[PDB]
Amino acid sequence: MKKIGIIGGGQLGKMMTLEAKKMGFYVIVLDPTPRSPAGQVADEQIVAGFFDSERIEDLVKGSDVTTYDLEHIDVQTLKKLYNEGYKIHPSPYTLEIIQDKFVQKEFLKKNGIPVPEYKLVKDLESDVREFGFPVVQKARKGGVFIIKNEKDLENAIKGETYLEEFVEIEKELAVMVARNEKGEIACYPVVEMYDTVIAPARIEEKYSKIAREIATSVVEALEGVGIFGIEMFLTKQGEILVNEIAPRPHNSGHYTIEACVTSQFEQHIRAIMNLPLGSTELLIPAVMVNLLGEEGYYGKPALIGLEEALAIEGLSLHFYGKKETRPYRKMGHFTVVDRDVERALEKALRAKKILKVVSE
Amino acid sequence: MKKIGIIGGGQLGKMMTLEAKKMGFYVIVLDPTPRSPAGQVADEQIVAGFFDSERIEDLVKGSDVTTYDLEHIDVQTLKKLYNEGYKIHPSPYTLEIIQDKFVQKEFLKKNGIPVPEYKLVKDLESDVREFGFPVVQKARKGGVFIIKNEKDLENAIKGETYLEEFVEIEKELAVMVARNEKGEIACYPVVEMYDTVIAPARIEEKYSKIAREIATSVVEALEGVGIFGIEMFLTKQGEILVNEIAPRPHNSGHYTIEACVTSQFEQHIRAIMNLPLGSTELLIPAVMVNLLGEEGYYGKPALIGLEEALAIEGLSLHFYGKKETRPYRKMGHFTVVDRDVERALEKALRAKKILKVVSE
Numbered sequence: 001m002k003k004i005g006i007i008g009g010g011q012l013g014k015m016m017t018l019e020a021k022k023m024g025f026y027v028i029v030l031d032p033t034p035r036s037p038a039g040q041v042a043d044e045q046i047v048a049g050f051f052d053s054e055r056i057e058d059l060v061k062g063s064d065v066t067t068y069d070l071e072h073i074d075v076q077t078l079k080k081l082y083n084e085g086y087k088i089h090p091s092p093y094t095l096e097i098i099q100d101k102f103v104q105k106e107f108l109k110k111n112g113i114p115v116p117e118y119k120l121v122k123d124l125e126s127d128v129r130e131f132g133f134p135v136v137q138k139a140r141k142g143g144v145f146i147i148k149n150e151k152d153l154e155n156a157i158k159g160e161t162y163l164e165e166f167v168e169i170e171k172e173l174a175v176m177v178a179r180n181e182k183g184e185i186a187c188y189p190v191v192e193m194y195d196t197v198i199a200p201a202r203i204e205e206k207y208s209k210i211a212r213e214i215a216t217s218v219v220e221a222l223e224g225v226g227i228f229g230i231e232m233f234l235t236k237q238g239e240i241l242v243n244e245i246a247p248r249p250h251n252s253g254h255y256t257i258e259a260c261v262t263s264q265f266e267q268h269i270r271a272i273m274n275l276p277l278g279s280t281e282l283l284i285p286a287v288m289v290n291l292l293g294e295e296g297y298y299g300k301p302a303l304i305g306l307e308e309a310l311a312i313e314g315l316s317l318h319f320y321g322k323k324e325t326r327p328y329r330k331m332g333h334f335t336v337v338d339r340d341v342e343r344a345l346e347k348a349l350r351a352k353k354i355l356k357v358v359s360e
Numbered sequence: 361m362k363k364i365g366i367i368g369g370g371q372l373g374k375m376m377t378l379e380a381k382k383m384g385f386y387v388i389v390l391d392p393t394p395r396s397p398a399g400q401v402a403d404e405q406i407v408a409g410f411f412d413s414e415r416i417e418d419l420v421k422g423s424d425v426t427t428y429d430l431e432h433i434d435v436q437t438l439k440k441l442y443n444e445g446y447k448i449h450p451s452p453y454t455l456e457i458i459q460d461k462f463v464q465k466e467f468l469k470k471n472g473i474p475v476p477e478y479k480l481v482k483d484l485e486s487d488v489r490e491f492g493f494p495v496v497q498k499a500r501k502g503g504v505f506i507i508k509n510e511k512d513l514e515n516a517i518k519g520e521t522y523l524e525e526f527v528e529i530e531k532e533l534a535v536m537v538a539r540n541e542k543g544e545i546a547c548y549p550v551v552e553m554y555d556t557v558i559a560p561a562r563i564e565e566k567y568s569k570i571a572r573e574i575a576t577s578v579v580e581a582l583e584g585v586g587i588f589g590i591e592m593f594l595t596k597q598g599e600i601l602v603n604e605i606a607p608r609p610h611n612s613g614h615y616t617i618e619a620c621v622t623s624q625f626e627q628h629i630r631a632i633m634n635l636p637l638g639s640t641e642l643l644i645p646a647v648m649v650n651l652l653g654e655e656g657y658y659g660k661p662a663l664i665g666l667e668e669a670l671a672i673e674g675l676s677l678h679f680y681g682k683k684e685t686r687p688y689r690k691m692g693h694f695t696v697v698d699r700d701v702e703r704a705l706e707k708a709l710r711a712k713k714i715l716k717v718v719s720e
């Protein structure tokens with residue numbers, strides 16, 4: 001039984017190990033938190049930090065393939081292990097390119113992938129003048145500040161940053177795309193950010209075809225292995241530009257669990273194990289909605305509105321096992337499937353007001 | 361957070377456990393095997409046998425609602441607790457009715473539920489005679505013997521058995537049906553036994569309609585709470601008779617996980633928690649096949665044919681993490697979803713020869 005190593009034992013990692021074991025694989029989770037969510041349901045867990053070079057190395061050498069559910073990781077030791085032959089997917093090199101938002105943009109531009117106009121900042125006040133207000137500023141490494149006036153510019157993000165033209169967004173889109181080392185690619189439906197996800201995106205065939213073609217291009221240019229979450233902007237001028245790349249299963253890909261033949265999590269395992277990719281057929285439209293911790297609440301998690309929300313046909317719930325609720329924190333998500341996406345959304349919005357994660 | 365107690369740590373209980381925690385419930389599993397499949401992903405496990413009176417008592421009293429994944433359990437102690445007001449679903453009384461095939465037949469007959477003519481054995485030889493050859497003999501509690509003539513009376517089943525008329529079976533059908541304490545019912549599509557399940561059964565719609573009606577009337581008569589597996593016979597003469605009742609999620613219902621909006625396991629949780637039931641809509645036809653350990657293999661499980669099998673579109677694998685394979689033992693199942701049920705069956709049977717659980 002081949003062993004899959006997973007760095008990061010949070011929710012994304014747990015869902016990963018669950019699908020991996022379901023496919024008959026042994027899983028070792030590396031997380032600093034003893035009995036992490038993923039470690040709890042994994043075969044083994046290495047209790048160490050995401051930069052404990054020594055331990056991440058014990059994971060890689062003790063696994064057939066190593067993957068990860070988060071980006072803030074020791075990419076350096078990973079590149080070394082990758083260079084001497086150990087299987088790490090996605091490649092620590094693509095992770096590196098993605099870590100630094102500027103180099104990610106640079107990479108996308110060079111490979112012919114549409115992206116917002118950007119500019120490395122060396123002379124802040126001098127560079128912003130090349131865009132004029134409003135302009136967008138982002139931190140190169142992990143955030144995003146929208147400079148609209150003088151007072152904001154005087155209080156801009158400090159550190160290594162870069163500028164981006166403020167994009168006139170018609171809609172924000174996303175698409176999961178997986179790829180084998182063999183080269184097979186599986187592209188999912190383009191979805192829409194209403195944080196709520198609408199699948200499929202209510203957009204002209206013309207645009208979804210383009211969004212799918214660009215998402216594939218990115219993974220290809222990257223020679224990626226695993227599943228990737230590509231965020232895009234459909235502009236007010238009819239242009240599709242990629243905003244960011246997530247080298248792992250993405251929150252905007254959860255709908256696949258209830259709406260597609262193979263979930264994003266099953267694809268990721270298939271992809272990193274170089275197995276034949278699974279069908280991405282959308283069996284039914286779906287609207288997903290994150291269950292964030294309520295504003296002004298702290299402590300013991302409490303889910304309210306369950307009975308009433310479950311009465312909505314097509315509604316199902318995914319509550320994560322978290323011991324502490326924090327405002328804005330991702331406590332879970334719920335999805336609504338309906339033959340008619342519009343009815344799916346109406347219901348989801350209705351439920352959104354009902355389902356709340358409170359404290360005590 | 362409400363607590364759900366589950367007696368039985370096998371694969372069914374594990375699948376129930378996960379779905380339960382997914383809905384935000386706390387789960388405590390009771391199983392005589394330490395680190396049982398279900399206990400490993402539950403919150404707590406009580407190491408104890410299914411007849412350890414005082415231990416199942418701790419489980420029920422420490423839970424808001426208790427259920428089970430098998431029938432061979434201390435039903436009498438549960439009846440005691442149930443009479444004290446503790447929530448146990450399905451009721452120990454229902455479990456009691458189903459555990460004995462004769463009382464079960466007596467019950468169905470008392471409620472007008474279509475069933476084969478039967479008779480309790482007082483004097484084996486004399487009773488079979490007034491029935492005529494051939495006749496079917498069944499143990500009341502523990503399997504089936506067809507008495508073709510006098511000679512067979514010597515090898516007849518010993519103990520307390522009952523007799524029933526021989527039925528000329530055309531097809532064997534199954535249907536999952538869940539019910540709330542509030543009385544809400546949720547009926548699934550009827551499936552066809554090929555051990556491989558075909559969803560939906562390839563039968564004239566007139567039969568499907570009656571099969572779902574018969575099944576629903578069964579759980580209604582029982583005033584059942586939870587999801588039930590209703591096994592029926594479609595005779596050569598166009599009659600639909602109920603043969604068996606399973607008071608729990610059933611193997612013939614695994615298809616729901618891949619082809620229906622809400623799986624039988626989520627449905628079961630909804631029903632025992634008296635919450636609104638989920639949609640049973642069939643999103644796409646499906647064929648499920650059980651994976652059993654191949655003959656002559658013992659020890660650590662090992663799979664063969666995965667790549668060739670996963671190359672088949674719509675094929676997904678569900679390998680249970682059993683710590684040892686053994687001939688004929690259920691190690692998991694795989695499903696093949698396809699818009700065309702005949703292509704699903706074709707693919708499934710083709711893969712049934714490729715996927716195999718062997719020893720390492």
Ligand SMILES: Nc1ncnc2c1ncn2[C@@H]1O[C@H](COP(=O)(O)OP(=O)(O)O)[C@@H](O)[C@H]1O
Binds near residue numbers: 136164165167
């Ligand atoms: N170039 C841009 N022009 C206008 N709005 C933008 C631009 N880039 C990002 N945004 C907005 O800010 C949000 C943050 O985008 P993102 O780069 O993914 O930051 P984060 O790391 O929080 O996700 C987006 O949802 C989008 O609405």
Ligand SMILES: Nc1ncnc2c1ncn2[C@@H]1O[C@H](COP(=O)(O)OP(=O)(O)O)[C@@H](O)[C@H]1O
Binds near residue numbers: 504526532
């Ligand atoms: N009354 C009957 N007439 C003819 N065949 C029967 C009858 N009852 C059962 N059988 C056959 O025997 C098989 C198993 O009997 P069953 O009642 O399901 O016992 P069990 O499920 O515990 O093995 C059925 O699948 C069916 O093919």
